[PDB]
Amino acid sequence: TGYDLSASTFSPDGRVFQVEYAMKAVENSSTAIGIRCKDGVVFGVEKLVLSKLYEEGSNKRLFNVDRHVGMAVAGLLADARSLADIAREEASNFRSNFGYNIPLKHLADRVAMYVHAYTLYSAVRPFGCSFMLGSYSVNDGAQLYMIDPSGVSYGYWGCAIGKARQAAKTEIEKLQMKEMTCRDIVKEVAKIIYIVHDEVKDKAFELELSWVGELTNGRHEIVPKDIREEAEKYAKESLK
Question: How far is it, in rounded angstroms, from Cα 190 to Cα 141?
Answer: 24
Does 38 bind another protein (CB under 8 A)? Our answer is no
**Quick check: 74 and 29 in contact, CB under 8 A?**
yes
Q: Closest CB to another protein among 56 and 199?
A: 56
Does 93 bind another protein (CB under 8 A)? Our answer is no
Does 76 bind another protein (CB under 8 A)? Our answer is yes
Among 14, 99, 200, 225, binds another protein (CB under 8 A): 14
Q: Closest CB to another protein among 57 and 224?
A: 57
Please give the angle made by the CA atoms of 177, 183 and 185, to the nearest 5 degrees: 30
Question: How far is it, in rounded angstroms, from Cα 237 to Cα 209?
Answer: 18
Residue 63, phi-psi category: left (phi > 0), alpha (psi -120 to 50), beta (remainder): beta
CA 130 to chain centre: 7
Binding region for another protein (CB under 8 A) out of 147-155, 183-191, 204-212, 214-222? 147-155
Q: Closest CB to another protein among 52 and 240?
A: 52
State the minimum distance, in angstroms, from the CB of residue 230 to another protein: 26
Question: How far is it, in rounded angstroms, from Cα 148 to Cα 129?
Answer: 7
Does 10 bind another protein (CB under 8 A)? Our answer is yes
Alpha carbon of 130 to those of 10, 78, 151, 208, 219: distances in Å? 22, 12, 9, 17, 23
Does 29 bind another protein (CB under 8 A)? Our answer is yes
Among 38, 67, 89, 156, binds another protein (CB under 8 A): 156
- Rounded (10°) angle between helices 104-120 and 77-98: 130
Among 17, 198, 202, 221, binds another protein (CB under 8 A): 17
Question: How far is it, in rounded angstroms, from Cα 128 to Cα 232?
Answer: 30
Among 67, 88, 169, 187, binds another protein (CB under 8 A): 169
Does 208 bind another protein (CB under 8 A)? Our answer is no
Binding region for another protein (CB under 8 A) out of 64-72, 148-156, 201-209, 224-232? 148-156
Does 72 bind another protein (CB under 8 A)? Our answer is no
Does 123 bind another protein (CB under 8 A)? Our answer is yes
**Number of CB atoms found within 10 A of residue 232's CB:** 19
